[PDB]
Amino acid sequence: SPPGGERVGILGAGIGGLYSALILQSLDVPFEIIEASNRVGGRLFTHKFPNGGKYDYYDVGAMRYPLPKSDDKGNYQPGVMQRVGQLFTYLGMHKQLIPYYFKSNKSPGFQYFNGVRARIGEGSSFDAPALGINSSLIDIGVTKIVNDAVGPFAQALFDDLQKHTTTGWDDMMKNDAYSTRSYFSFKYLPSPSFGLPSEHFSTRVINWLETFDKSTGWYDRGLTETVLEAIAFGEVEVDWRCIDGGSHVLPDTIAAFLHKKGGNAFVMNASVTAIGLENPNKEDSPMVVVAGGQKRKYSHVISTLPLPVLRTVDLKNSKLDIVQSNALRKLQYGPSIKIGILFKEPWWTTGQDKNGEKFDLVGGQSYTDLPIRTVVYPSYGVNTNAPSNTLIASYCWTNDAERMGSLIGTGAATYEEQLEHLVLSNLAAVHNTDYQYLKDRLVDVHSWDWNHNPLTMGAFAFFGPGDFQDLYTSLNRPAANGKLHFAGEALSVRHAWVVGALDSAWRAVYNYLYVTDPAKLPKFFELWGKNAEWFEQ
Amino acid sequence: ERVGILGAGIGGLYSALILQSLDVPFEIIEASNRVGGRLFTHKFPNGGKYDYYDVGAMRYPLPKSDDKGNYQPGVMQRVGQLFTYLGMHKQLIPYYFKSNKSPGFQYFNGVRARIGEGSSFDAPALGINSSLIDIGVTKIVNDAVGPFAQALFDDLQKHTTTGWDDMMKNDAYSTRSYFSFKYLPSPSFGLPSEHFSTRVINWLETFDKSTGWYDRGLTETVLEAIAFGEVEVDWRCIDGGSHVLPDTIAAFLHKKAFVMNASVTAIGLENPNKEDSPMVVVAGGQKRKYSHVISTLPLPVLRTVDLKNSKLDIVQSNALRKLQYGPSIKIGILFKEPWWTTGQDKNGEKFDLVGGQSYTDLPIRTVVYPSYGVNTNAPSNTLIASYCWTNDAERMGSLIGTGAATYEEQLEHLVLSNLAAVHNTDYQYLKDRLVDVHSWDWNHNPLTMGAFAFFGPGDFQDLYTSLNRPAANGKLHFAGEALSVRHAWVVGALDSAWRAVYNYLYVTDPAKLPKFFELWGKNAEWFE
Ligand SMILES: Cc1cc2c(cc1C)N(C[C@H](O)[C@H](O)[C@H](O)COP(=O)(O)OP(=O)(O)OC[C@H]1O[C@@H](n3cnc4c(N)ncnc43)[C@H](O)[C@@H]1O)c1[nH]c(=O)[nH]c(=O)c1N2
Numbered sequence A: 001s002p003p004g005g006e007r008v009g010i011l012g013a014g015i016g017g018l019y020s021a022l023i024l025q026s027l028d029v030p031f032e033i034i035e036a037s038n039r040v041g042g043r044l045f046t047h048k049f050p051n052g053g054k055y056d057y058y059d060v061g062a063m064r065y066p067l068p069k070s071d072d073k074g075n076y077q078p079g080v081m082q083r084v085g086q087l088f089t090y091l092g093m094h095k096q097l098i099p100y101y102f103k104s105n106k107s108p109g110f111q112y113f114n115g116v117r118a119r120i121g122e123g124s125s126f127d128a129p130a131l132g133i134n135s136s137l138i139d140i141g142v143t144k145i146v147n148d149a150v151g152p153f154a155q156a157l158f159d160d161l162q163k164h165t166t167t168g169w170d171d172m173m174k175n176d177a178y179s180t181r182s183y184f185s186f187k188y189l190p191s192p193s194f195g196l197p198s199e200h201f202s203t204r205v206i207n208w209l210e211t212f213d214k215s216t217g218w219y220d221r222g223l224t225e226t227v228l229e230a231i232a233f234g235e236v237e238v239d240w241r242c243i244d245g246g247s248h249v250l251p252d253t254i255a256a257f258l259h260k261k262g263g264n265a266f267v268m269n270a271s272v273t274a275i276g277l278e279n280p281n282k283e284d285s286p287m288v289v290v291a292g293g294q295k296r297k298y299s300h301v302i303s304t305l306p307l308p309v310l311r312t313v314d315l316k317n318s319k320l321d322i323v324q325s326n327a328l329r330k331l332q333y334g335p336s337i338k339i340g341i342l343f344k345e346p347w348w349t350t351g352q353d354k355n356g357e358k359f360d361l362v363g364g365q366s367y368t369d370l371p372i373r374t375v376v377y378p379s380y381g382v383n384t385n386a387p388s389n390t391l392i393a394s395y396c397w398t399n400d401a402e403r404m405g406s407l408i409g410t411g412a413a414t415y416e417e418q419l420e421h422l423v424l425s426n427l428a429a430v431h432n433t434d435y436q437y438l439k440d441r442l443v444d445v446h447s448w449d450w451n452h453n454p455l456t457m458g459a460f461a462f463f464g465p466g467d468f469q470d471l472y473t474s475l476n477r478p479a480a481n482g483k484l485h486f487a488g489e490a491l492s493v494r495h496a497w498v499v500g501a502l503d504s505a506w507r508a509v510y511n512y513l514y515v516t517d518p519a520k521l522p523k524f525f526e527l528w529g530k531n532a533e534w535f536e537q
Numbered sequence B: 001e002r003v004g005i006l007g008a009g010i011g012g013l014y015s016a017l018i019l020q021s022l023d024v025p026f027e028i029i030e031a032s033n034r035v036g037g038r039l040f041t042h043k044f045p046n047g048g049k050y051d052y053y054d055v056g057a058m059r060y061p062l063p064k065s066d067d068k069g070n071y072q073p074g075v076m077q078r079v080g081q082l083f084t085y086l087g088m089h090k091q092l093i094p095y096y097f098k099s100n101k102s103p104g105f106q107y108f109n110g111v112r113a114r115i116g117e118g119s120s121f122d123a124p125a126l127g128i129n130s131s132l133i134d135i136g137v138t139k140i141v142n143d144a145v146g147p148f149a150q151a152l153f154d155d156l157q158k159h160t161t162t163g164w165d166d167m168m169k170n171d172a173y174s175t176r177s178y179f180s181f182k183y184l185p186s187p188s189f190g191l192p193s194e195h196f197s198t199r200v201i202n203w204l205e206t207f208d209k210s211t212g213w214y215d216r217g218l219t220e221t222v223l224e225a226i227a228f229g230e231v232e233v234d235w236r237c238i239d240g241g242s243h244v245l246p247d248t249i250a251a252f253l254h255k256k257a258f259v260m261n262a263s264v265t266a267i268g269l270e271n272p273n274k275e276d277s278p279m280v281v282v283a284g285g286q287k288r289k290y291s292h293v294i295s296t297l298p299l300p301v302l303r304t305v306d307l308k309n310s311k312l313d314i315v316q317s318n319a320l321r322k323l324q325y326g327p328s329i330k331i332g333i334l335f336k337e338p339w340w341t342t343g344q345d346k347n348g349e350k351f352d353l354v355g356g357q358s359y360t361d362l363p364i365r366t367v368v369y370p371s372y373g374v375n376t377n378a379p380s381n382t383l384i385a386s387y388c389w390t391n392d393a394e395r396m397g398s399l400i401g402t403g404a405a406t407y408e409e410q411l412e413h414l415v416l417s418n419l420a421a422v423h424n425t426d427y428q429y430l431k432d433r434l435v436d437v438h439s440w441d442w443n444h445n446p447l448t449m450g451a452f453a454f455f456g457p458g459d460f461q462d463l464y465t466s467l468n469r470p471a472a473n474g475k476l477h478f479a480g481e482a483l484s485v486r487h488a489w490v491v492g493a494l495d496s497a498w499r500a501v502y503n504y505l506y507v508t509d510p511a512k513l514p515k516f517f518e519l520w521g522k523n524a525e526w527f528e
């Protein structure tokens, strides 16, 4: 059935594009990967500090994976991230997965809010009474309040995954015009068991929720993203894992697997500038991709380029319908920054604060309302004879990342100095040290703003209210007479996760096989799942 | 007595003007080597007199004025009075919000038309029924915003606050959630008495504002509609660029100074336990003492300053973080000629554009043709090829200031391609005429950390008032355009300086209040 000249052009050598190639290679479908940069992995990006040891790296993008439980053979239980787990096993990486400590493996991480410092779990109110948060709300806590609001939506979506239905999603979409904030302000009413007034929370209380629940401005994005990310993070049993040597090992291993025999050479350093049918009036017209100044023709094209990147590509002759072209612009992205610092020692593990109290932190995270917002201690290498000296001194989202981004990548020594001093000062206040204690231990600094990077043009999809219900489906349909397939993490309900990109590749390849070679569907299903998301042992 | 003014932008310069007029010693601390802040004029090297463009403030919707520079009551009256005070009234030249000749272009969903030609831009294929198309986005948005704006207008006119109280009961709405859960169309529209769908709301945002605007606070939509006059005004710009305004103030102040190239890193009382404790500002590595401090630093900048010993209360410290800012970018291009005025498209039709603007859903979003110099013997050859807000500015920002030629070339090619599609020319027609490109991302600038305040829902009702109270035992006063209801406008910065100086005089020398009122108004906002 399929014409002898079938060849799928895969745009982007990120995890979505590499996964697409892996599926196609397993089905003996020719492909070619076009990559703008000189590296593979995309937002799987591991920075190694040259002056450091083996574990003196940090992941600028993906770094932690909340996988389902697994057996000794690498078989994963059903779960949100099962597809990621099965990929590791497929590549022979299951035993190379090491623990990721979401919470510290020893003493608890720190919380520093409203000038009040405490350990996670100590039950501090962080001066919330002075904010006007009454004692009833404090006793309940932000976590339980948010879970009561998110739980019902999340439970229906879980039932969808388990029972293979879409009613939970249809119900979510009835409320998708809500932001998390507008949901709390105009619809949510506390559970009767809380004993609170049957009234909507005030803005003061809602902002208290956001402060401790997420990041500045998170609640102005879609309520749907809040429930979906709560599901992904498992905030509603997960095995937190990271990759020994950094997440770059995953795309490196895929590239090696595809390259083993002769080699599926990649077209590197070829930025795509145009995608369209050679002749949109001919039904059998092939696709033409202009990348690096050269025209390359393919029967079908699987794009993993971020939506904002597609907006910089000439899509004339790809015949997007009016909804799809609106979707490329309106489907909202979110920002993020990370700042990694190589120190002379893992002071968070062996050091003490200005009063002699030991931090006693191994992995885990600390949280603060200061500009750095989140501090992440490394879980990799903690038990070796050369533990990591590298800290993620700041990991920000939404407004916090937008503001901090102005100090990153300026190219000016004076702003690098301002940035370092701000970060160290924030770190000192979080951990109760002086600035000089941390300055004396600092060796090198590396910082990254995914919202100032031409190859991503944002950290990841972070939809606003209405995006999922109005525009999302349009990009799950192909364009260019069925020959342009949109993929990438934006094309999932697991935005900002590797599984999102993997799901997007499954759906793109499924559509390609469905319209070009249905005889491969059985093997496609057996190797890569009967469904993108619906569970299955 | 000596007031430390942090920031030599228009808010700090205005604060200095007021203090000088009242014989109050002051000192201005400025991080950079320039005054004006977000009044920032870029002149292209090798270009002519009018081959500049304003990277920040560029247009002023002032009230009517007489031959002597007296301005009628209005939102921007305070700005007009500032021009007159500085002897600049006659240096104000017309700014053409719309083209002075043929109308600008609209390019949406691949459909090109002139402003006013009534195109639907393929909206039926988008699922917008004919009734909504016939009414139009402008009338629909005005019907939803009008009631709120009129009550705030009445506040300014009648000297009341009930309009603001009503706005604040609805401040938890974004514009989108207001349309999705509250707004019901006027019965006169003959539409179903139901809330608009997301598809229709996204159609409104597309033609009304920028990508993501409607997810910000409804109050900002109402306030900006008032400021733009979309609910009359004399649109003006400053001959030679907005930089002339701060340059003229600084020159006036230097005759009677400034601490330049001194970035503020710490603000706090010398001894918070002593009542008479002076303020200490650490700038450029040096400690400077003041009786009171007026800060005009943006809120995100204040978050990078050590405010230990300024004794912010818990609401004020929350406000510095949460009160939301918005992004913006501009791209200026020097061409060999004002092709938008003298040229023709690929089919021989003349653009015939003088000033005004064109709009598109393409990445550049907005094109602004210069109004300065149009009638001289050397008209401007400089175009604002792109001016973006919200998501459009966030996305485009990734291509600006990379320092890499390859991305500078990608940016130029995208901008020219978008321009070509908007105006119906070939790419090479514009490339052959391009001389120089300058681009700026106010959301990638340590001195602003965002373009301007652009509050989310709830910010005005929950956190805004806390920063109008002082900190540091009453000796730290917060100012800057964020401390106003005219965000993203010069008048916003001026209002914040009035309130900051007002509070300063109130606690230190109330006998000067009568003269303060006489020279600078009895109220910040209330009309005369
Ligand atoms: C800061 C941060 C942190 C995290 C994460 C992201 C970020 C930004 N994620 C999310 C995860 O990193 C992300 O969802 C996927 O890696 C995205 O893979 P894609 O293939 O969809 O895009 P991705 O962007 O990775 O790949 C696209 C490719 O296209 C290329 N390209 C761009 N423009 C091009 C052009 N014009 N022509 C050709 N090629 C072009 C790029 O260079 C890149 O190689 C994550 N996930 C997770 O599971 N766990 C985690 O802990 C995290 N944490």
Ligand SMILES: Cc1cc2c(cc1C)N(C[C@H](O)[C@H](O)[C@H](O)COP(=O)(O)OP(=O)(O)OC[C@H]1O[C@@H](n3cnc4c(N)ncnc43)[C@H](O)[C@@H]1O)c1[nH]c(=O)[nH]c(=O)c1N2
Pocket (backbone or CB within 6 Å): B006, B007, B008, B009, B010, B011, B012, B029, B030, B031, B032, B034, B035, B036, B037, B038, B039, B055, B056, B057, B058, B059, B060, B262, B263, B264, B265, B296, B297, B298, B301, B328, B329, B330, B442, B446, B447, B448, B451, B452, B479, B480, B481, B482, B487, B488, B489, B490, B491, B492, B493
């Ligand atoms: C793109 C764009 C376009 C427009 C506008 C803004 C922008 C970004 N505006 C809004 C207007 O430009 C703005 O509201 C005011 O200029 C702000 O003046 P401020 O004094 O409040 O701040 P502004 O930011 O101007 O001044 C603050 C000063 O503090 C300095 N500073 C920063 N950090 C410091 C530190 N650590 N130590 C010391 N000094 C420090 C800065 O360098 C600067 O000099 C506008 N308005 C209008 O009326 N018409 C218009 O057309 C426009 N258009």
Ligand SMILES: N[C@@H](Cc1ccccc1)C(=O)O
Pocket (backbone or CB within 6 Å): A064, A229, A397, A495, A496, A497
């Ligand atoms: N998954 C990534 C990024 C992310 C950001 C925001 C929401 C969800 C995920 C993390 O764990 O940090």
Ligand SMILES: N[C@@H](Cc1ccccc1)C(=O)O
Pocket (backbone or CB within 6 Å): B059, B224, B389, B487, B488, B489
């Ligand atoms: N006042 C500026 C900036 C602005 C942006 C958004 C709203 C209001 C004002 C302008 O006229 O472009």
